[PDB]
Amino acid sequence: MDILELSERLDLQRFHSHTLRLYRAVCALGNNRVAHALCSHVDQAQLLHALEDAHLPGPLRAGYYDLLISIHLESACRSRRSMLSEYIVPLTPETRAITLFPPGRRHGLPGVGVTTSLRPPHHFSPPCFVAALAPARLSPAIPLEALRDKALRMLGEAVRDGGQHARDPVGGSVEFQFVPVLKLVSTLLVMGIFGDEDVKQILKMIEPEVFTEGLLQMKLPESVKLQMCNLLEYFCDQELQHRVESLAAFAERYVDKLQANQRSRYALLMRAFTMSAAETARRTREFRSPPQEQINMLLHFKDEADEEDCPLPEDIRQDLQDFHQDLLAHCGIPQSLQELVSHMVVRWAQEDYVQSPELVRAMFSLLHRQYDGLGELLRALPRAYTISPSSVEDTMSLLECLGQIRSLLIVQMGPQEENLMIQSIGNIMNNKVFYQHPNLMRALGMHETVMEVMVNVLGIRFPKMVTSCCRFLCYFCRISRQNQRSMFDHLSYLLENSQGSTPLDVAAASVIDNNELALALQEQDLEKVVSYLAGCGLQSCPMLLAKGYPDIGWNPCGGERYLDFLRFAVFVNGESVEENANVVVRLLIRKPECFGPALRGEGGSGLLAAIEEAIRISEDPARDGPNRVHLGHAIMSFYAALIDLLGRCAPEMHLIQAGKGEALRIRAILRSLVPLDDLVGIISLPLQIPTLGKDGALVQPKMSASFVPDHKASMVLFLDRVYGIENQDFLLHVLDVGFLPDMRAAASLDTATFSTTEMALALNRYLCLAVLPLITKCAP
Amino acid sequence: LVYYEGGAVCTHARSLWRLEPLRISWSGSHLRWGQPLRIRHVTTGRYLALTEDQGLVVVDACKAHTKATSFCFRVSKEKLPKRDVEGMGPPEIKYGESLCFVQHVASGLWLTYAAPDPKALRLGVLKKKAILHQEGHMDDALFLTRCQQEESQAARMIHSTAGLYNQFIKGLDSFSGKPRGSGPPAGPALPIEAVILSLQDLIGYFEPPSEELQHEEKQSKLRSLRNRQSLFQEEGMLSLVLNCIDRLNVYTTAAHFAEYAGEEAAESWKEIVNLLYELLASLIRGNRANCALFSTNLDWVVSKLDRLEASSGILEVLYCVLIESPEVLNIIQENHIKSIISLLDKHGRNHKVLDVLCSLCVCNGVAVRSNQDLITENLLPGRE
Amino acid sequence: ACFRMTPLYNLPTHRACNMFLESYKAAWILTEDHSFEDRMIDDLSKAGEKKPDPLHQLVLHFSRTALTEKSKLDEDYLYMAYADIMAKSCHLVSFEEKEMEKQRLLYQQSRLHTRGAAEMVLQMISACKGETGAMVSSTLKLGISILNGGNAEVQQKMLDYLKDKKEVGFFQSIQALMQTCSVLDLNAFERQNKAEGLGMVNEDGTVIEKVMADDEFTQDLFRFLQLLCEGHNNDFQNYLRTQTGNTTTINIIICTVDYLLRLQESISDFYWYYSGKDVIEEQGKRNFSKAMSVAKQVFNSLTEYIQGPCTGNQQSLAHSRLWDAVVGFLHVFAHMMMKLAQDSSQIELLKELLDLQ
Amino acid sequence: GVEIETISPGDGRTFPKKGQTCVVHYTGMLQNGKKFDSSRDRNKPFKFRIGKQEVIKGFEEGAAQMSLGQRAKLTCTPDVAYGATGHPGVIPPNATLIFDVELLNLE
């Protein structure tokens, strides 16, 4: 039966309208793999037919208009719409030609002009079902120019017959006549399809007098008014984009002058200071301040209280004054878009009591942006960046990768989405722009997007994506000092959710080696880590329980980790962070279970005894665990890490010789916390050296699962920092009991065959880092 | 067994007690210090008591003999019933004030919290059991707060609904097997008219606020409705209804029910089984929590979609669950989608089924691609 | 650094154009001032030839967002911008002159509170559910703007709204806010002392407060409460103490006193910190002055609560531990007077000290 | 696997050798008689290089027997078509396709 027979077959209308809602749902939010399938159930010709069909009932007209957008345009629209808030403007001559007002001071038409901001081209693929049989599929191609011309034509037909208000409400009502077409035109405007002549046509159909019957030349429902708001917001965004682009073009044309006169001035000053000196001695401060403090000095000639302080000649100051006046005039400080919107919004509000909350919100957002133009430019200039014309290609690729990442935030995670995240993130990290332009990356807010996806996955399933995100963020933080500070504000989160790389090493990447960032920890955030340590020293991992392990009383696997972050927050750049030093000590002793099974006090075991027990547990297979994880090394790692960290908090020499009360108190507390005999005893362990011979073949002990000598390094540090070497006798004691039998262990290992055995390398690093420097210091 | 519990429990109904003085006349008089009074749990109708075996308990109403259940709020633990005054009385105790110690009247014992905090509290949070002690701690004084009339009414509705539906369930379990033959029903009469009326009343109790209701009124009534639904759910009224459905579901049709219950009883089988499915939706409509309860018994709902006795009601329950909970969307498998689609083939072209399928793809602006792919792969390529 | 500082003329063009943008924005665009709030509110207020006028549809819309049953109140930059606009609108020695200024301000506040602004302010304070942030700050500043001078009409409207809605949310959120209000600290002060001690220079970068950080918000909150009871209203001075009709009551007066005790604790902690240091350095001057401004506002709020002879609030304070606070304060006052008197560079701080006393 | 049935003769002289793009306008239908694709609706001829295995197999032995301008009907069995997997959402598994193919131009 004809589909227009669904004007009186209402049950089939309901079923079919909801069938189209089902189609739009199954292809919604990026599923281009299903959009291709739906192009075989509703083809282009049916869609383009239903767009122009006058007798379709409204619920089906709107449905077939929404279906076209969903199948073909919606993904490209959202991807473009996400890039419409960041203005990367390349310093090309095309950019250089941009001016606020068209030459020959009238506003030009909004949306009509030259725009150089980078927006990546949006990709389509043809729909064919005879192609042989996984990179993400692109949206089905529809001829955009024919569609655009049809959209303009339909909009034009609906308007000059809107004024007549005949009883021809194509679709059954004015709402169904207009809203579906306005949605399509708004979508195609946002995507970027419309040329300049087409934009002029749209503007004339909106308001013929201001832009040279209009859509405001007849009364409208509150659903059409919303789409009018969605069009005017586009033209209000293009004016802001124009302001930012013209301001970037002016920056390009004006920093050249500020550089040329700086160089000529420097030449003149170089001729000076010769036989004419001590009168220009101060005037070389400009050239020796940081470059922004030079560009911040130079631009100080607005208030007229600082005129001559600005070295700029008056001609140069004039260019900035004139452009500033132009900028003010452009911002408004009808015959104009601002006046048109400001009048029309108020008129709507005072003609009727608007019932749709969405309409009210859009109305008043538009009104705000019209009244406060200069405050809108000020809130977009944070997100404006000027790149050189050479970096355009890399930035374009990076923007495409970013779009992929932020397009999978409306999608519940799965396998394929995991793969796209990993590919995109690995691609960004391989882009030179990601390194060269850290400020762009924090301006685009990639770190926040990556944390959003990491939140969604953690809040574990999908460990690969977490490992990739936490690598990306740990690299973000190493790029530049401001990236750490940007990520440092997320420390509370990362500590809430705290292979090897995990949302804790991101937290320990924010604070590492930035003593200014260390001295911003909130004691409670150091506290929660200690809470996790407590939860790790009383029970054991259910993971190893599922791996059938001994499960003695406590897992050291999490304890070691959480004693690593606490090591990067107490000791930065080789000096002790006193403030963060004391707090962790207090929080550790207030909860004395965090110190492990040994050092528990009651029912205690000597630290030496505990290490000896872990030595004996290292060999017996029954008590080590029935591969990637072993225990004989695990307890040793935990205690070595604890001893290192406790050594870090020990005060440096300034406080110790200063007789500072808190310093001596903390040192005494640590001295009580661990005796001496165990310290020099774990110095005195036997270290199973790579055994020669054994039928001639090298058989080295696995120092991924044995007593690595690095364990002892920690206890070497503590002794230096806390107990110290004050008497020569104690030194000649430690030399025999623990030190020397190790150095000639290494010296025996110096042979050709055992030079490169991993034990030899570890022992060499050990001696050069811990023992030999201590001997050097105690040489006198 | 009583407890001192913290958290959201102090906005629930298990925490609501009712002070029942020992005088029927003037029972609403102003409470005075040290006057005898029973304390009745509202949602279970069990009186606080001191039994010899377990100390402090909540004994049933048949064993509250004024020696075990009598009590006396007192001001100070110093050693102090008054002559009844035929009036509202001299007002003594206030609300949110007036620290009061509860003293059992015969045993003198003060109500306190049991100090022992074992391994279960080594890492767990404290739920201090309440015990009666000879002398007790010095910090055991209690504020008395007041509950809104909505909460009190709901807490008493739960005490009657639970009793009624447990009678219904235990009646159904009387003839679970036991065919009637050609004789009489198995045991005592089912409370059918009472169940129908109670379900009808509870469906109106939970009716959504109307649309013409003006904005602020609408948003106040919504909060009240969410509160009442949470109370009923947390007192296990979304499990009593499920048990009633299951017991009434082992029978395919009313004649099958009649073969066990009787002709008159089976006259209301379809009506009851529809009212239960309506009340369930009324309980879960709009609550993300009550809809979250169905992340584990989703196969409970999907496996009843073909039942002809109440086929619209079960679909409505499914629609509410899917439209409110996004965690339910993640557990949908191909089994479930191939069953929701089979409703289209077996029950006709119904747009509500398409609405369900639309809700299976996007929940709160996030797309679940497995569901999209499954609907596309199963529904579409047949073109039938 | 002085040897290898790069003159701008060696930079690449883009990294200079990006410095220029920041300098231009800081020095030229930002410092530019434009008064549009008056004009915009005067255009939104007029109606065309009852149905709400355009401004009264704005107040109603933000009332709608506040009464929507959401667990937590969302970020709306639109509301935060319009609240600032409306606040600016109402902000703008002869007897005539003073009285004309007062009447003019009353008219400006009548533009708002005759269109529902007071109810919006109460609703959004209630809807924030005691979370510090920017929405609450904007709402409080709007409330202060429409209550300046003790606008009896606005106070009566607010009281009537709270009484008929019988909501416990408002006072359950004010209490939470005052509990979250920060108090003077030493630890954060010590840390930022050392953080500046690190230095000022960075590789192609320049270094950028965590002590008394929310002083503005705390001052605004207590100014709001004071403005609620200005004009010697008995109904407000008693409602703040007991909320009759509501299921539970929150005594705001004793909560103000309890905050003040935190405040005097911290204030005594600086005096003790500095009792050895012969001269209070500049950082101490700033932070101590900030604490003093907050203390002035808290003391003024307590006066307004009891200034009219509200007996209930008077003995509520008398039994409250207001006496510990004042007894403690007098110690700081006497000792800091002694120590500050010994230098001329600290005359300003001593003046602030005397005013606080 | 593919059964070519001439509907209207072409030239019977020039056949697509390997490596000549083939422009073909087509319409496709499941053997039960339902349509999944046409190029005529999209309005553009479909081009494919014979020998690069872009198209399904039967479509590639099939458009090779045709001549220039010929219009014929191919019946690709699932062996020389998609097969047991199918084109999910478009073609059900184990399906035979029928294509009305008109070889318009060679290259």
Active site residues of D: 26, 36-37, 56, 82, 99
Contacts of A592 (CB under 8 A, 6+ apart): A599, A600, A601
Chain breaks in chain B (C to N over 2.5 A) after: 80
Of residues A259, A349, A516, nearest to C198 (C-beta): A516
Number of helical H runs and strand E runs in chain A: 39, 6
| Alpha carbon distance, N-terminus to C-terminus of chain C | 49
What gap in Å lies between CA B111 and CA B141, rounded to an integer? 9
Using the 8-state DSSP alphabet, how is residue A6 labeled? G
Tracing tokens 């969903």 back to the chain, one arrives at: A70
CA distances from B261 to B180, B181, B243, B272, C108 (A): 7, 10, 17, 14, 77
Tracing tokens 């049935």 back to the chain, one arrives at: D5
Answer yes or no: are the C-beta atoms of A214 and A204 closer than 8 Å.
yes
- Taking an 8 Å cut-off on Cβ atoms, the answer to whether D92 and B376 are in contact is no
Query: What token pair was written down for A292?
Result: 């922004």
Of A680, A22, A774, nearest in space to B344 by CA: A22
Kindly report the backbone phi and psi dihedral angles of residue A411, in degrees, each rounded to the nearest multiple of 5, phi listed first: -130, 130
Q: Would you tell me how many other CB atoms lie within 10 Å of the CB of residue C100?
A: 11
A385 contacts on C by Cβ (under 8 Å) = 18
CA distances from A286 to A269, A292, A296, A308 (A): 12, 10, 10, 14
The alpha-carbon gap from C352 to the nearest alpha carbon of chain B, in Å, equals 41
Answer yes or no: are the C-beta atoms of C25 and A378 closer than 8 Å.
yes
User: Which element (helix H / strand E) includes C202?
Assistant: strand C201-202
Q: Look at residue A549 and give its three-state secondary structure.
A: coil
CA distances from A49 to A46, A133, A172 (A): 5, 31, 18
Q: Would you tell me how many other CB atoms lie within 10 Å of the CB of residue A411?
A: 19
- Taking an 8 Å cut-off on Cβ atoms, the answer to whether B222 and C69 are in contact is yes
- Taking an 8 Å cut-off on Cβ atoms, the answer to whether A129 and D89 are in contact is no
Provide the strand spans (E) within A158-208: none
What gap in Å lies between CA A489 and CA A486, rounded to an integer? 6
What gap in Å lies between CA A747 and CA D17, rounded to an integer? 76
C23 contacts on A by Cβ (under 8 Å) = 292, 295-296, 298-299
What gap in Å lies between CA C252 and CA B84, rounded to an integer? 39
Resolution in A: 3.4
B366 contacts on A by Cβ (under 8 Å) = 29, 410-412
What gap in Å lies between CA C254 and CA C322, rounded to an integer? 8
Of A682, A695, A692, A689, nearest in space to A770 by CA: A682
Of D92, D33, A21, nearest in space to B382 by CA: D92
Written as one letter, the residue type at C348 is E
Q: How far is CA A621 from the centre of its chain?
A: 46
Q: Look at residue B91 and give its three-state secondary structure.
A: coil
Answer yes or no: are the C-beta atoms of A329 and C34 closer than 8 Å.
no
The CB-based long-range contact list for B347-352 (8 Å cut-off, 24+ gap) reads B347/B311, B349/A11, B349/A12, B349/A15, B350/A15, B351/A14, B351/A15, B351/A17, B351/A18, B352/B315, B352/B316, B352/B319
Using the 8-state DSSP alphabet, how is residue B125 labeled? P
Partner chains of C (3+ C-beta pairs under 8 Å):
A, B
Measure the CA angle with vertex A20, ends A19 and A23; round to 5°. 95
Of residues D41, D85, D91, nearest to A43 (C-beta): D41
Using the 8-state DSSP alphabet, how is residue C325 labeled? H
CA pseudo-torsion sign A214, A220, A222, A224: negative
Answer yes or no: are the C-beta atoms of C349 and C284 closer than 8 Å.
no
Interface B-D: count of C-beta contacts within 8 A? 14
- Taking an 8 Å cut-off on Cβ atoms, the answer to whether A40 and D37 are in contact is yes
Of residues B365, B370, B376, nearest to A414 (C-beta): B370
Query: What token pair was written down for C301?
Result: 């709020």
* H runs (alpha helix) in chain C: 13-24, 37-45, 54-67, 77-91, 95-113, 117-127, 134-147, 152-165, 169-180, 187-198, 215-228, 234-239, 252-274, 282-307, 311-319, 322-340, 347-356
Query: What token pair was written down for A228?
Result: 């009018």
User: Which element (helix H / strand E) includes A140?
Assistant: strand A139-140
Kindly report the backbone phi and psi dihedral angles of residue D98, in degrees, each rounded to the nearest multiple of 5, phi listed first: -125, 125
Torsion on CA atoms A42, A46, A48, A51, rounded to nearest 10: -100
What gap in Å lies between CA A44 and CA C199, rounded to an integer? 66
- Taking an 8 Å cut-off on Cβ atoms, the answer to whether D34 and B376 are in contact is no
Query: What token pair was written down for A253?
Result: 């044309």
Kindly report the backbone phi and psi dihedral angles of residue A554, in degrees, each rounded to the nearest multiple of 5, phi listed first: -175, 135
What gap in Å lies between CA C307 and CA C300, rounded to an integer? 10
User: Which element (helix H / strand E) includes A778?
Assistant: helix A772-778
Q: How far is CA D22 from the centre of its chain?
A: 11
Substitution target from C59, C63, C67 for chain B, most B beta carbons within 10 A: C67
Chain C residue whose CA is closest to B217: C67
- Taking an 8 Å cut-off on Cβ atoms, the answer to whether A351 and C57 are in contact is no
Of residues A37, A44, A132, nearest to D90 (C-beta): A37
Answer yes or no: are the C-beta atoms of B247 and B171 closer than 8 Å.
no
What gap in Å lies between CA A10 and CA A172, rounded to an integer? 14
What gap in Å lies between CA B346 and CA B343, rounded to an integer? 5
D102 forms bridges with which residues in the sheet?
Answer: D25, D71
Interface check for B370 against chain A (CB to CB < 8 A): the answer is: yes
Of B310, C217, D43, B349, nearest in space to A127 by CA: D43
Partner chains of B (3+ C-beta pairs under 8 Å):
A, C, D
Burial C2-38, CB ≥16 within 10 A → b, else e: eeeeebbbebebbbbbbbbbebbbebbbeebeeebbe
Measure the CA angle with vertex C343, ends C337 and C347; round to 5°. 65
Q: Would you tell me how many other CB atoms lie within 10 Å of the CB of residue A433?
A: 20
Q: How far is CA D96 from the centre of its chain?
A: 12
Answer yes or no: are the C-beta atoms of D89 and B380 closer than 8 Å.
yes
Answer yes or no: are the C-beta atoms of A595 and A588 closer than 8 Å.
yes
- Taking an 8 Å cut-off on Cβ atoms, the answer to whether A579 and C190 are in contact is yes
Chain A residue whose CA is closest to B359: A25
B119 contacts on A by Cβ (under 8 Å) = none
What gap in Å lies between CA C18 and CA A387, rounded to an integer? 9
Half-sphere exposure (Cβ direction) of B233: Cα atoms closer than 13 Å: 22
What gap in Å lies between CA A672 and CA A720, rounded to an integer? 16
Contacts of D86 (CB under 8 A, 6+ apart): B381, D92, D93, D94, D95
Contacts of A656 (CB under 8 A, 6+ apart): A663, A664, A667
Of A498, A544, A551, A486, nearest in space to A525 by CA: A498
CA distances from D82 to A126, A625, C202, D93 (A): 19, 51, 64, 8
| A contact residues 312-331, partner C, Cβ 8 Å cutoff | 320, 324, 327-328
CA distances from C84 to B57, B249, C140, C216 (A): 59, 62, 10, 15
- Taking an 8 Å cut-off on Cβ atoms, the answer to whether A15 and B354 are in contact is yes
Query: What token pair was written down for A130?
Result: 């005879």
What gap in Å lies between CA C9 and CA D94, rounded to an integer? 72
Of residues C69, C247, C248, nearest to B219 (C-beta): C69
Torsion on CA atoms A663, A665, A670, A673, rounded to nearest 10: -170
Q: Would you tell me how many other CB atoms lie within 10 Å of the CB of residue A115?
A: 16
Burial C188-227, CB ≥16 within 10 A → b, else e: bbebbbebeeeeeeeeeeeeeeebbebbebbbbbbbbbbb
Of C7, C156, B356, nearest in space to A263 by CA: C7
What gap in Å lies between CA C144 and CA B173, rounded to an integer? 67
Of B259, B325, B249, nearest in space to B287 by CA: B325
- Taking an 8 Å cut-off on Cβ atoms, the answer to whether C247 and B222 are in contact is no
What gap in Å lies between CA A37 and CA A33, rounded to an integer? 7
Burial A116-136, CB ≥16 within 10 A → b, else e: bbbbbebebeebbbbeeeeee
Written as one letter, the residue type at B191 is P
Q: Look at residue C39 and give its three-state secondary structure.
A: helix
- Taking an 8 Å cut-off on Cβ atoms, the answer to whether D37 and A130 are in contact is yes
Query: What token pair was written down for B324?
Result: 């409110």
Answer yes or no: are the C-beta atoms of A625 and A631 closer than 8 Å.
yes
Rg (CA), chain B: 26
Answer yes or no: are the C-beta atoms of A501 and A474 closer than 8 Å.
yes
Tracing tokens 């090394």 back to the chain, one arrives at: A633
What gap in Å lies between CA A690 and CA A711, rounded to an integer? 17
| D contact residues 85-104, partner B, Cβ 8 Å cutoff | 86, 88-92
Q: Look at residue B63 and give its three-state secondary structure.
A: helix
Torsion on CA atoms C2, C8, C11, C13, rounded to nearest 10: 160
CA distances from C197 to A608, C200, C281 (A): 41, 9, 14
Touching pair A, D by Cβ (3+ pairs < 8 Å): yes
Helix axes B269-284 and B311-324, enclosed angle (nearest 10): 10
Of A586, A431, A582, A562, nearest in space to A505 by CA: A562
Kindly report the backbone phi and psi dihedral angles of residue C33, in degrees, each rounded to the nearest multiple of 5, phi listed first: -115, 140
What gap in Å lies between CA B46 and CA B58, rounded to an integer? 5
Answer yes or no: are the C-beta atoms of C287 and C350 closer than 8 Å.
no
Q: Would you tell me how many other CB atoms lie within 10 Å of the CB of residue A447?
A: 20
Of residues C68, C247, C248, nearest to B219 (C-beta): C68
Experimental approach taken: cryo-EM
Q: Would residue B144 be called left, alpha or beta, if left means φ above 0 and alpha means ψ between -120 and 50 degrees?
A: beta
Answer yes or no: are the C-beta atoms of B203 and B237 closer than 8 Å.
no
Of D27, D29, D38, D10, nearest in space to D104 by CA: D10
Of A537, A528, A463, A536, nearest in space to A501 by CA: A463
3-state secondary structure A349-408: HHHCCCCCHHHHHHHHHHHHHHHCCHHHHCCCHHHEEEECHHHHHHHHHHHHHHHHHHHC
Query: What token pair was written down for A221?
Result: 């429902």
Answer yes or no: are the C-beta atoms of A531 and A498 closer than 8 Å.
no
CA distances from A336 to A106, A108, A206, A362 (A): 9, 9, 13, 19
CA distances from A447 to A425, A453, B213 (A): 11, 10, 45
Partner chains of A (3+ C-beta pairs under 8 Å):
B, C, D
CA distances from A395 to A19, A79, A115, A190, A398 (A): 42, 16, 17, 21, 5
Touching pair C, D by Cβ (3+ pairs < 8 Å): no
Q: How far is CA C110 from the centre of its chain?
A: 23
Kindly report the backbone phi and psi dihedral angles of residue D103, in degrees, each rounded to the nearest multiple of 5, phi listed first: -75, 100
Output the known binding site of C.
Answer: 230, 304
Tracing tokens 């549009």 back to the chain, one arrives at: C36
What gap in Å lies between CA A735 and CA A729, rounded to an integer? 10
What gap in Å lies between CA C144 and CA C91, rounded to an integer? 10
- Taking an 8 Å cut-off on Cβ atoms, the answer to whether C248 and B145 are in contact is yes
Output the known binding site of C for Ca(2+).
Answer: 230, 304
CA distances from A339 to A89, A216, A331, A342, C19 (A): 29, 14, 11, 5, 34
What gap in Å lies between CA C237 and CA C309, rounded to an integer? 10
Contacts of A587 (CB under 8 A, 6+ apart): A523, A526, A527, A530
Contacts of A527 (CB under 8 A, 6+ apart): A587
Rg (CA), chain C: 24
3-state secondary structure D59-78: HHHHHHHCCCCCEEEEEECH
Tracing tokens 């920690």 back to the chain, one arrives at: A714
Q: Look at residue C343 and give its three-state secondary structure.
A: coil
CA distances from C172 to A383, C66, C177 (A): 39, 16, 9
Interface check for A377 against chain C (CB to CB < 8 A): the answer is: yes
Of C156, C65, C76, C81, nearest in space to C113 by CA: C156
Burial of residue B120 (number of CB atoms within 10 Å: 0-12, 13-18, 19+) = exposed
| A contact residues 278-297, partner C, Cβ 8 Å cutoff | 287-296
Using the 8-state DSSP alphabet, how is residue D42 labeled? T
